Every structure is written in structure tokens, then in C-alpha cells.
Amino acid sequence: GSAVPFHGAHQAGIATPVQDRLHFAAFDVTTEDRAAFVALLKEWTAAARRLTAGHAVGEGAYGGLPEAPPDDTGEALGLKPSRLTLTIGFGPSLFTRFGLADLRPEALADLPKFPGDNLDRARSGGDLCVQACADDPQVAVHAIRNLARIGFGKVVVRWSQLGFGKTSSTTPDKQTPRNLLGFKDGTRNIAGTEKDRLDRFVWAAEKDGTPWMTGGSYLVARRIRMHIETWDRASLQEQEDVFGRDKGEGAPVGKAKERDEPFLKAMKPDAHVRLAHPDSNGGATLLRRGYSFTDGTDGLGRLDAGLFFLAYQRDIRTGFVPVQRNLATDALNEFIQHVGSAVFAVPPGVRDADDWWGSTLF
Amino acid sequence: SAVPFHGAHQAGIATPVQDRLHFAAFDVTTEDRAAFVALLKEWTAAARRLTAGHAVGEGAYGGLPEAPPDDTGEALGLKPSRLTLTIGFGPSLFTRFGLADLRPEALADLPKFPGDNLDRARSGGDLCVQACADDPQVAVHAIRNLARIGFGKVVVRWSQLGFGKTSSTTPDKQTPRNLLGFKDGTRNIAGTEKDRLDRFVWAAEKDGTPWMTGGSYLVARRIRMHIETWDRASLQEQEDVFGRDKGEGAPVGKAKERDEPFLKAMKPDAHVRLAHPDSNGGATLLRRGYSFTDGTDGLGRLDAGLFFLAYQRDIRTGFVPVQRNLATDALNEFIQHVGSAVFAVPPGVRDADDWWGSTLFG
Ligand code: HEM
Ligand code: HEM
DSSP, X not given: OOOOOOOSSSOSSSSSOOOSEEEEEEEXXXXXXXXXXXXXXXXXXXXHHHHTTTOOSTTOSSSSOTTSOOSSOOTTTTOOOTTOEEEEEEOGGGGGSTTOGGGOOTTSOOOOOOTTOOOOGGXXXXXXXXXXXXXXXXXXXXXXXXXXXHTTTTEEEXXXXXXXXXXXXXOXXXXXXXXXXXXXXXXXXXXTTOHHHHHHHTSOOGGGSOGGGTTOEEEEEEEEEEOHHHHHTSOHHHHHHHHTBOSSSOOBTTOSSTTSOOOGGGSOTTOHXXXXXXXXXXXXXXXXXOEEEXXXXXXXXXXXXXXEEEEEESOGGGTHHHHHHHGGGOGGGGGEEXXXXXXXXXXXXXXXXXXXTTTTTO | OOOOSOSSSOSSSSSOOOSEEEEEEEEEOOOOHHHHHHHHHHHHHHHHHHHTTOOSTTOSSSSOTTSOOSSOOTTTTOOOTXXXXXXXXXXXXXXXXXXXXXXXXXXXXXXXXXXOOOOGGGSOOSEEEEEEESSHHHHHHHHHHHHHHTBTTEEEEEEEEEEOOOTTTSOTTSOOXXXXXXXXXXXXXXXXXXXXXXXXXXXXXXXXXXGGTTOEEEEEEEEEEOHHHHTTSOHHHHHHHHTBOSSSOOBTTOSSTTSOOOGGGSOTTOHHHHHSGGGGTTOOOEEOOEEEEEEEOTTSXXXXXXXXXXXXXXXXXXXXXXXXXXXXXXGGGXXXXXXXXXXXXOOOOOSTTOOTTHHHHO
């Protein structure tokens, strides 16, 4: 129920322990007024400071003038902060506005088309994103709802995705969660304590070429549908062969324990772990931070199920792209389809109470 | 930790309200009564394992490598999480298996209500399973595995995820708020009120349908809220719609949440005044609904609301009179009923040899 500090050299919500729930929103910008957008970023930052401390936005949820709408919509009253983090990112399309063309980071690369992609353009892209993570879904929805309200007339929600449970880990001391295929997902990630690895693989540095992004990161989001009918009729051995880890313990094939190091040559050549491992990708390493989803039925008698894959990295071109390119032959591809995609530049942290989201850019 | 599965009544009605819901409606594809009975027995056996935190069948791993696992594995390592699984039978089931003369009279078709905009695809269903647990992955796992066991005999027609409070951070005695920011559940039937349950919730043998003794009747309504319209209303308008204040949730003119309402102080079309038993000839409901937030629609609006669940001894004397009385509810401006279903929820599974539906099928 505790608060996660909002201020820092980096935004929270990346290296932070992974919270139970996600509400991710992508927004498009509808104002051409730079000043008006800056004013919004400042108002959003002020709101975020309140929300992440478990306080209502503005002048509160009640006790104001009866004839005015409340400043806060009120559905989080009486709730703890619930480890809420709010992480903002800027999409490539933002940089066509407000005289920002020359400030688009090279590391903010458009993704190439990957074999098997079936991207819904309506649930892809976005000028900006807010990732709300919390242990309480109500706290996360409240945050997104109030941000959108504050932004009325300046931004619209383009698409959103709720995640009912995590399928990632930045805390190797704690139990690794399972995805909806039944496997542990997050064993070999980057932990929030691994400062050297975060600097090497996750945080943008000044020397990378875009000074305003120093201390930020780059985010890839992929909405991935899972073919659970197809998966659920596969044998145990087929499932384990797909990954290169056993299902029960999640140990690498041949070994006894989850956290024993993979011996890649014992895996099938098309095993997911083998193809995704840094050693198979010239050292490319990602911070994975995704969540599971189910959005009803598919209209053909089955549950809908998928994984909202999020990865943070220092450079999209040296993180997600190489690794996804190497998954072209993945055995897992029989059972998944990417159906939504977005990339974002996640700026540096809000340093103190006078700072604001995007201040280094604007 | 866990809730007993066996009882005179099914669990999940009068037992403590858990933090999360996965509700699924199923349609039956087989015409063979014997095949359906066999399915009910297999599902009962699965439910016994699931509610005790155990995998279905021979487990999620460690069986024959060349066989699909009996349990899909995504709840391994999780706790029982107070899982309850409650089954119900829709009116349409009774057109199968020679059952037409065993449809309870209390399982009434709902009339059309003013302002209904029901999606046929998220309405009805031959049967339902209500899965409630504190961990949504435990609930989803239960539905996913029941659906799998049933493949070839049943299909999933529609599915809804929902959330109430998060118990780890929110005291049990605090009333949850709905997404309109009002406390929701103050004046309800509590599972401690054994006589009120007998009067208003459980079917009695003398009511007309012996197989349903100890069962109940369920109305499910998917109710969208027009969030962005509501959030533009003044605080006064919002309070006037309900007849309670927003901060404390006290009836107008009173000081505390649990102060008994004075109906005449409320506006004539206030929700509480219209829905109160005194306004409806004494009609009283067990509400056990959950909030939902599914995402955003094509206009960028929040697809959110209340998945309303009411249990009652007879649909004709519970939901129908109360909902009829809400014809002029001030709340109607901000809500729309977009899905509907009714179910007969049979008596409890008495012991280890009993099975869901045994009083009906014989
Ligand atoms: C639905 C899609 C996916 C599923 C079900 C899935 C599942 C898994 C599982 C079970 C593991 C092993 C445990 C672990 O170390 O985390 C794993 C590892 C990994 N996955 Fe995936 N994954 C998916 C998509 C992706 C994608 C899209 C990428 C990157 C483009 C990726 C990158 C990785 C990486 C880097 C590892 C760790 C490999 C290592 O260093 O040992 N995964 N995944
Ligand atoms: C989105 C839709 C709805 C919302 C937001 C809503 C909200 C509320 C709220 C805030 C209260 C007062 C606190 C409480 O006693 O729980 C209440 C009471 C109640 N509601 Fe609703 N409600 C909705 C729909 C319905 C429907 C469809 C029915 C029945 C057909 C219903 C029946 C009741 C009853 C019986 C009470 C208790 C009245 C009393 O005895 O004081 N509600 N509702």
C-alpha cells in the first residue's frame, strides 16, 4: 500500500518492482499551441505528485463549491497509494508538432515490419503514453481518468490497454509470475538493484547523442494475442521445447532450478530462450515489464487472451529490434500474433517539486 | 485463505465478497443429456480442486510428456485466494434435454426496460460460471480450465472481468466506491443476515420448484457509465442523483454513512429513493456486483461501469419491481444497460459424491 517516490533522476515505473496491475493509455495531441501543451504537462505533473502520494487532485473530490464539478472524480478516496507509478512517454508523431522535428532522438526508431505482424492501426502508435501501474486497479483507472479529464481539449485517448496481472519481474528475490501459457516469465530480466546493468542497457546517456533524453529510456509496446486453443492441445514436451525451460520449476532444460544459468546448446535451435538470450544477440539485453490481458471472448466460442509486452531499453535499435529480428524462427510464433505496436521516448525523471514532465525537451 | 466448496448453498453468494470477478456465460453445443451430465460431474471435480488451490486432473506438469497437461498451469504457485465457483442455468438450457417442464416459474424472462440497449452477443447464455477470488489470475485460470474441459460440449458466449476493493490495502469494513465515486453497498443484504437471506435470497421448497430448494436466482446486467458526462456534472447534481453525499455517503440531512435514509428529504427521482425497499413494496436484493473497466471505445471514451449482479428468491419479486421503479431515475442520464442475463443458481454441492445440477438431472 506504500507510496513509490515520484521524483528522481529517472521516472519511476521502470526499474521499480513490478506492481500487480496496469492501465496503459496512448494519447493523441489536439492542440497546436506549444504554450498550451507545456501548461498541460505542468498540470499533469502536479496531478501526478498528488496521485502517487494517494491524495486527490486539485482541490479534492468533495467539499468544494456545490455548483462546480469536483476537481477529483473521487473513486480513489480512502485508498492507499498502492505503489502507483505514472510514467510518461513521447511518440515519434509528437515531434511533427511544436517545432520539435530536430529534437526527435535517433534511438527513437520506427520498428520495421516483422514476419507474422497483423497490426491494428487504431490500437497502435500514439503521440504520447501514460503507463499507470499500481497494486489496485481502481487506483490505476482513477489516475488515467483524471489525467485525461485535465487534458480535455488538448489531448484525446487514442487507445488503452488494461493488464490484469503482471508477467514480468524486476525483483529476482520474489516469486516470478506466470503468463497465460503457464510458464514463469521474468526469470532472466534486469533487476532494479542492478545499477550497472540499468546504466548499460536501459538508461539513455548524454553521450548517446540526444542530451534532453539523458536519464530517460525508450519503450516498445507490443500487444500480442495468444492462440490458447492451439497451445492447450500441445503436449507438455512440445510446450517445454518451445521455451527451453521446464514448466513446473522453470529451470533451463537439463537443470534443476529456475535461476540456474541456461545451457543454450541443450535447447532446441528454435527455442524462445535460446533465440532471445543476450548471448544469441550480441549482448542485447532488455528490461521486460509486461502484463497479461483478456478482453472478453473472440466471438468464436473462446476466451481472448494475450500479453501486453513492454520493454525498456537504452536504444530501440540495439534492444528490441535485434532480439525481435532473431525471433523470426521462434517456435513460439506458432502460438502468438503481434496485433498492436507503439514506441515511445520516456523522458528523464522529475527532479524535484519545481520540475515537470518533459521539461528537458520543452 | 479458502472458502469451503461444499454446503447446502453454493458458495459465492452469501460468502465474503472477494476482490475480483471473472464471470463467463456458456452455450451448450451437445444435444446428449448423458454427455452434459458427465460434463457437470467433471466440472464439479475440477471445481473441488480449483477452490482448494490445487491443479485440475493429474496436474499442470510431471505427467506423460506426449500428453497435453490436464491443467494449463498459470495458477501454479498461487494461493486459493478465496476462490468460489458458482454455476447457474439460463432459461435457454431448459429447451434442451427434455427439461422444458422443469424451468422454474421464478426464472422469469425480463421485460424490456426503458433505455435498454442490450447487445445480444453479451446477453443470455445457457449457463454461467461466476468465479470470484482475490487474485484475478486465480479466477481467470478457473474459467479457462473449465472452458477447456468442456470443449466440444460448451462454448464461451461472453466473459466479463471485474474488480471491487483490494483487500491487502483496504480494510474489510470500508464500503467500496463505484466508478462514479460514490460508496456502493451501504444498504444491502449481508451474508451474516441468515433470516434476511432465507426471506429474500434462497429458494424454498414451497415456492414451487423442488429441485431449486436452497438455490437462488441471478440477474446480471452490464451497465455502462457515461464517465465523461458524469465528470462534468456539478457536485450538487451528483449528490442529488443519489440522495447521499459523495464524501461520507450519508443520506441527505444525516451525518453518517450508515444513518438510515429519510426518503422524503431526497429528490423524487433520486436513485436511493426509487430503489429502496419502502418504495417497492418491501422488495429487497442481494447485490454482489463488480466494477469493470474494459478499455476505451472508438470515440476515446472510457468503457467502464458496473457489472451488476443481484441474487434473489424470485426474479419477479426482486429485480423486476425494483428496476421497473427506476424508469424515472435521475441516474439514467449517466448509465446504459448494455447486457443482460438471468440464471437459476442451483443448490449447493452437499459432499464429495454430489455434483453441480444433481437435483435437476437426478
Ligand atoms: C507472448 C509472448 C511471449 C511469451 C509467452 C514469452 C515467454 C517467455 C518465457 C517463458 C521466458 C523464460 C523466462 C524468462 O527468463 O523470462 C522468456 C524469456 C525471454 N523473453 Fe519472452 N515471451 C514472449 C515474448 C517475447 C518478446 C516479444 C521478446 C522480445 C522481443 C521476448 C524476450 C525475452 C527475453 C529477452 C527473455 C530472456 C532470455 C534470457 O536471457 O534467458 N519475449 N519469455
Ligand atoms: C451503474 C449503476 C448503478 C449505480 C452506480 C448504483 C449506485 C448505487 C449507490 C451509490 C447506492 C447507495 C449506497 C448503497 O446503499 O449501496 C445504491 C443503492 C441501491 N441500488 Fe443502485 N446503482 C446502480 C444500479 C442499480 C440497479 C440496476 C439496481 C436494481 C435494479 C439498484 C438497486 C439499488 C438498491 C436496492 C440500493 C439500496 C437502496 C436502499 O435500500 O437504500 N442499483 N446504488
